[PDB]
Subunit: 162 residues, 6 copies
């Protein structure tokens, strides 16, 4: 079974308010990350057709500053599907509604694991791209997914050490 990256794509438009920003008109990194986590989890469930858990936030790159009164569009897709696990890619765009352009302000990758009711890993469908943006994330996923497994084993050492 295969699902396109589009089938489980989730959208979220949100505006940046003063309670969401810092001391320099600039969005709290923590607030961006919470929203990222929220949209990615739903995208992961839709795709898996099962409850999911976050194994890890593999990265969040802050690329362009986000200020109060800015309009955000979050886009989430499954970019890699292993046995029970998926990489979700989230794009966070600054949406200019007065000259109708979009700039990529942050980029994030997350790893979710699907669970049955047992609490055990559930097989998930595979995923496939349909346009080239989807293909870009799809093609680059395998080098990211192995680095994820490598850094979780150096994370294995660290817990053992402590």
């Amino acid at each position: 079974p295969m699902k396109s990256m589009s089938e489980s794509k989730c959208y979220k438009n949100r505006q940046v308010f003063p309670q969401d920003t810092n001391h320099h008109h600039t969005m709290f990194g923590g607030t961006l990350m919470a929203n990222i986590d929220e949209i990615a989890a739903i995208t992961a469930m839709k795709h898996a057709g099962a409850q999911v858990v976050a194994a890890s936030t593999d990265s969040v790159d802050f690329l362009k500053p986000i200020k109060t009164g800015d309009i955000l569009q979050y886009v989430a897709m499954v970019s890699y599907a292993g046995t029970s696990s998926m990489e979700v890619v989230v794009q966070i765009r600054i949406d200019d509604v007065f000259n109708n352009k979009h700039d990529l302000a942050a980029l994030s990758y997350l790893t979710f694991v699907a669970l049955d009711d047992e609490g055990k890993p559930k097989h998930v469908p595979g995923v496939y791209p349909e346009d080239d943006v989807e293909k870009w994330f799809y093609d680059t996923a395998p080098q990211r997914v192995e680095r994820r497994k490598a850094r979780r084993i150096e994370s294995k050492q660290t817990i053992e050490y402590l």
Copy 2:
């Protein structure tokens, strides 16, 4: 100029409440990340002696599930100091308070840039470990820092592509 990892170490004790969990009694990943972001930024400022910006969240590994009513301890330290940049390591512990135990539930690494009154990169002091845990993060930090730089190469290639 040099600072110990301890000089700028920040602590945060917080309890896990219903408002913070999902309907499986498990802590929202986004909430953990907002708190991680908050504690790490303060640690980064203390150390830099200047305002700072988040360049990136390099990873969050969720290692043990966190449930409602659990007591958390966040510990943040600067584990690497470059020219203008800091890696902050944040440890999130589940604190067993009548068996006085601590289990490592999540581990995160973040990157900050110090800024002058203008908004341009500012020199930061170097950092040094004093105990063997501090030395562990310090010693393993350089292998992590190159991966950080290699992988934002992928992010601009990705921005370029889009």
Copy 3:
């Protein structure tokens, strides 16, 4: 100048939890409705907007803890400076891929120039049969809107 109902269409997916309740509390739903409708109206007007009124929120099916919500907002009517936004709130069944309409809301926004004055907005046109259903039923709702702000007019006068 015209925009389709799709051009300014905004989406929001949300899961329902306890801080959100096993019936979802209305206040939470109404904050999310207002948030999504305003962004759709800005996108359409290409200008700052203000909420003139919430014309209705209909609670049709209860929303329970752990339900997954999908909000869809569209401009269903554009007069001179004012837009009607319709928000559909769906209970999104993701393991059997069903959708049930749980709540329905209609709001009225006015576009503003930099002054603080009403700004002309482009028109709107439907492209599919759902968009047409809301587009076609909008005109009775819109004067019912101005009809009750004349009744709102008497009320403030009296008080």
Copy 4:
């Protein structure tokens, strides 16, 4: 069995804080609607002496902008009591304490249904006005109510079509 509009009257003074406003320092239509819904539900419970559920928000009219640091006074009353259903009216006042004035900033009408311990519609006492303002909302209620029942017919036609 009958109750005056005053018997179930609820009050709420609240100040408007940044957490409640957008970047024009203007109160969120959504926050206001949550507060209206909260005060109306309690007034509806008091009148019916039963748990209640919201069938609808019949209207909210935004009449004067509400700004940060403004002091609000909410007043909720039952303006109509049918068999199992109640109309609640909420007046939202900007409360000026330096000259002791009140200006009407928003007006809302909501519809609640009283429920059995089973969850089936429960009979409510009737309601009666005692002054000229209460009589004004009372005399104007039946027209709003007939519109309410009409608007749920169009709500079902919409559902059928979808």
Copy 5:
């Protein structure tokens, strides 16, 4: 110049939500204290007819537990007025709205100072009771007020020592 205790009396009905309670379904002391502080300031502004600042929360006594879904009624009054300062008393009641009983669940006393538009202390009117509840708090204020002036001497000793 004098005001009765009733002139500046503020009311607030609020229901207790999950967001307000802990993992034992029990209201956050911090939330109650925030709500207490909010209503008292307004009562203080009303009495003084000027901006106010909180000098202290003189005590909050938790007398009966407050749970999720409970309905609270807060009542705030000026119980004492010195030259520039006011004591506000807040009663927090659990409101049984189907048997119309009230239990006093918490009791708090706060002290505000009225300020002029510059930011210096402003004189406030005197205060007087009209019923037996109002006279109860008025008559017992002198000991609370002396408890208050003593405790800011000890607060100064503490600062000097630190």
Copy 6:
């Protein structure tokens, strides 16, 4: 059985932001005070705890936006089942590495068993010159607390 004031000492660093004339809202400060103190009391008692009272919160220096706050909570007194927790709220100047005491609070917690009845707690002892200042002065605050609990129950009696 005894624990030092340090064994259960808790820390919390926070910055003062929008959601928080920008002069920090007392309610935000008091919410944070209550949270940090309850955790210190559990740590000390090694048991679930309830807040009996907030004995005082003194606002000593205004806290304005961009201040960095450091909260420190300690057990300053331990009776049979009850604890006084002292919370220090500091304005932490981080580029001059100095500290100002902005607010000071004392709270009273009672320890509870799984039954829900008062649980005995270990005693407390100071180790440094600051800990001894709070320790030595606690009994007069503590008696002032036991008197105010009577006046509060009597108040209930009267109403």
